[PDB]
């Protein structure tokens, strides 16, 4: 059986990568970063409460101008808020009520949402007709859209539930690059600050670092045990942190190909639903299923506070690009802005 | 007062947007949502054609001043847990089992049956965390082909512990009770089991009666009586 010798070839390749990583790591993050004095406690007050969603919210994304944010929900509604003055800038009605993700374009002219209808539709905010209309429907996946993020006004990567990430091209309509290699249910997605790489998480507890330019899986990170739910880069671009269903949040590293710290706690027994990083990268914020977000000192693995404000499961979370505030959505249908 | 003219018009634009979200939520909270489930070729398409006249498939039908939405999810060949937590708060579940598939072993992994996979599916859906109060409207499909297939072959192939003389009544009642036994909690949920065929003329009334019971419970929940 040539498949058996091919499998033992792959097994010794696993062995080589395992001892390469083991010889690669000498000191952890916590041994060399124990000597920095900790933050301590952080008291973030709910500065705003954006209400107007009626069913559960699974998605949120901040603007690059750090003032407008978009949010998606199961009442078929995509709402752009003015986070300073709680005003609803726009309210987009969706053709499919089952949406699991949303993005807000870096230029600010587009939003994209997609869900169980296997289509990450794209909506045009800036219109001469005054209304938000749908511009392109990106129908090429056979599993549900778990994440879709804009690279540019014309390019968008779409994580999907059919194990496949896909670089798209909004002008034509067709996926120029297809990213395969995960074995179950790709759940999340995070773009590099230079937007030339991206990571993704799946339900085989593996985080794969990709390459937008050619379309290959450059690295693979396996340190979890349960299904990865959300993922995020460190702001420097060299590291990323992820969160899975085993109440464990891990900070992996691109340039060393390694896990740096585990941000688990002995008291937490519910799955992370969303993660994000602060502007300096000092804080890691993780949404949770026990209804409240937890802030973590990213360099000491200490919980620096709890953003307890929600009645139901925190589903989505994000820090602004100026680092000013944190918006958390939840299943009780209330965005809260913390500062 | 301490606002501009433009920020004043922004505030009233947001108030109009609030108003339209309120109307659309009141419209969408008075319609009945049903999650249609089942195995492969269980007769789900048959009852879609009965109640009517890629990705998720949604069916709109109305019946006696009640507007229904029925969400077929058979095309979702993915992990069930994520998109099944997206489906809580649904009024009822229409679960489809074909009676005639008791002796049909599965087309893939030939050691395994349709009926025991349908039992495994029913156990996972009924004992779910997200469906602890949801009334399951079980539909038992193809009674006619079950008659011409139980006149010739016994049900002891699928249920050897069954002890009956292979007629229309007791074999169907045994497999009905075998499906009903799959609850851990028989006091929260209410399972509504029906027998039907493609020729059967009125079985949307069964769904209507089950959702009228669920609507009574939700009307009492909305009046504080829970």
């Amino acid at each position, epitope marked *: 059986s040539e498949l058996d010798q091919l499998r033992q070839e792959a097994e010794q390749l696993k062995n080589q990568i395992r001892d390469a990583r083991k010889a690669c790591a000498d000191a952890t993050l916590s041994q060399i970063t124990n000597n920095i004095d900790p933050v301590g406690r952080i008291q973030m007050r709910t500065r705003r409460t954006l209400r107007g969603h009626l069913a559960k919210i699974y998605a949120m994304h901040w603007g690059t101008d750090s003032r407008l944010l978009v949010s998606a929900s199961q009442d078929g509604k995509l709402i752009i808020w003015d986070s300073y003055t709680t005003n609803k800038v726009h309210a987009i009605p969706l053709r499919s009520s089952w949406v699991m993700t949303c993005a807000y374009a870096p230029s600010g002219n587009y939003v994209a949402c997609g869900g169980l209808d296997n289509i990450c539709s794209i909506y045009n905010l800036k219109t001469r*007709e005054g209304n938000v209309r749908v511009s392109r429907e990106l129908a090429g996946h056979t599993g549900y859209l778990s994440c879709c993020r804009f690279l540019d006004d014309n390019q968008i990567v779409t994580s999907s539930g059919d194990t496949t990430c896909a670089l798209w091209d909004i002008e034509t309509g067709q996926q120029t690059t297809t990213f395969t290699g995960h074995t179950g249910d790709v759940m999340s997605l995070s773009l590099a600050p230079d937007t030339r790489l991206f990571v993704s998480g799946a339900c085989d507890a593996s985080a794969k670092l990709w390459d937008v330019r050619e379309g290959m899986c450059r690295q693979t990170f396996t340190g979890h045990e349960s299904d990865i739910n959300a993922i995020c880069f460190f702001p420097n671009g060299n590291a990323f942190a992820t969160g899975s269903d085993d109440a464990t949040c891990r900070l992996f590293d691109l340039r060393a190909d390694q896990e740096l710290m585990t941000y688990s706690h002995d008291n937490i027994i519910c799955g992370i639903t969303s993660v994000s990083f602060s502007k300096s990268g000092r804080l890691l914020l993780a949404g949770y299923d026990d209804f409240n977000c937890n802030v973590w000192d990213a360099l000491k693995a200490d919980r620096a506070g709890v953003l307890a404000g929600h009645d139901n499961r925190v589903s989505c979370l994000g820090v602004t690009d100026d680092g000013m505030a944190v918006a958390t959505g939840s299943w009780d249908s209330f965005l809260k802005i913390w500062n | 007062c301490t606002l501009s003219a433009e920020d004043k018009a922004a505030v009233e634009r947001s108030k109009m947007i609030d108003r339209n979200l309120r109307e659309d939520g009141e419209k969408a909270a008075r319609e009945v949502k049903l999650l249609l489930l089942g195995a492969g070729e269980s007769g789900k398409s048959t009852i879609v054609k009965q109640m009517k006249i890629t990705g998720i498939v949604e069916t709109h039908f109305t019946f006696k001043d009640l507007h229904f939405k029925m969400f077929d999810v058979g095309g979702q060949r993915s992990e069930r847990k994520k998109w099944i937590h997206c489906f809580e708060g649904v009024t009822a579940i229409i679960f489809c089992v074909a009676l005639s598939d008791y002796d049909l072993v599965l087309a893939e992994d030939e050691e395994m049956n349709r009926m025991h996979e349908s039992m495994k599916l029913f156990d996972s859906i009924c004992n779910n965390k997200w469906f602890t109060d949801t009334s399951i409207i079980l539909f038992l499909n193809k009674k006619d082909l079950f008659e011409e297939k139980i006149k010739k072959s016994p049900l002891t192939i699928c249920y050897p512990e069954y002890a009956g003389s292979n007629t229309y009544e007791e074999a169907a009642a045994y497999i009905q009770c075998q499906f009903e036994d799959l609850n851990k909690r028989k006091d929260t949920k209410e399972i509504y089991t029906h027998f039907t065929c493609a020729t059967d003329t009125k079985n949307v009334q069964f769904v209507f009666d089950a959702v009228t019971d669920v609507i009574i419970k939700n009307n009492l929940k909305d009046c504080g009586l829970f």
Partner: single-chain antibody
Amino acid sequence: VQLVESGGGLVQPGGSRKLSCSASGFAFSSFGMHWVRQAPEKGLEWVAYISSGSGTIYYADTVKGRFTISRDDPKNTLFLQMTSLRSEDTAMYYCVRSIYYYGSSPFDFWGQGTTLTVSGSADIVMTQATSSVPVTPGESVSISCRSSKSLLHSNGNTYLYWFLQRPGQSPQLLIYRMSNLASGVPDRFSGSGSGTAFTLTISRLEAEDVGVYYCMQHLEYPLTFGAGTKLEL
């Protein structure tokens, strides 16, 4: 996107006439509306403002309580009901479209206008330092407009607008909120200015920049224009 305006013409003094403006081509139910008039040789002059959903209505203090603005949302048609047509209401009535959310560009699309020939001490007054500037093409120009109160609100938005009227054409929008270009306006235009002092800097002038340039404030109501500077070749 077109705003064709009906009605208008030669009337009797003390008469009544309903001017109309039928929108077609956009979501007019989500747009605020204005009427802005100009005399046959003076600058523009704001008349009224009905908003989306007819909730909030202001008027010019010259004609408050005597005009009547009224929108129709299903048929997408805008009305101005005028009674007792005095001789100071001989003007060119424009149907202006505007929309107010964060990042929006009010006063962007204007109607073709309609002529109607008939035979306030806290208002912030806009002063234009000239009315005629002779400029050769390819030359950098600076048009100045002066306020009487600081237009920098506490939120940060400086509600100053810069319009343009080609001779024979309807007004367009060039600069909204003192520093932001409109869409379709070439990037050679650049307004800037501190509190009460505003300069619109045209650069590399061509033949299509010849016209009269208006500075409107939008801090409060009524909306007040400057005199306007007719640029010449």
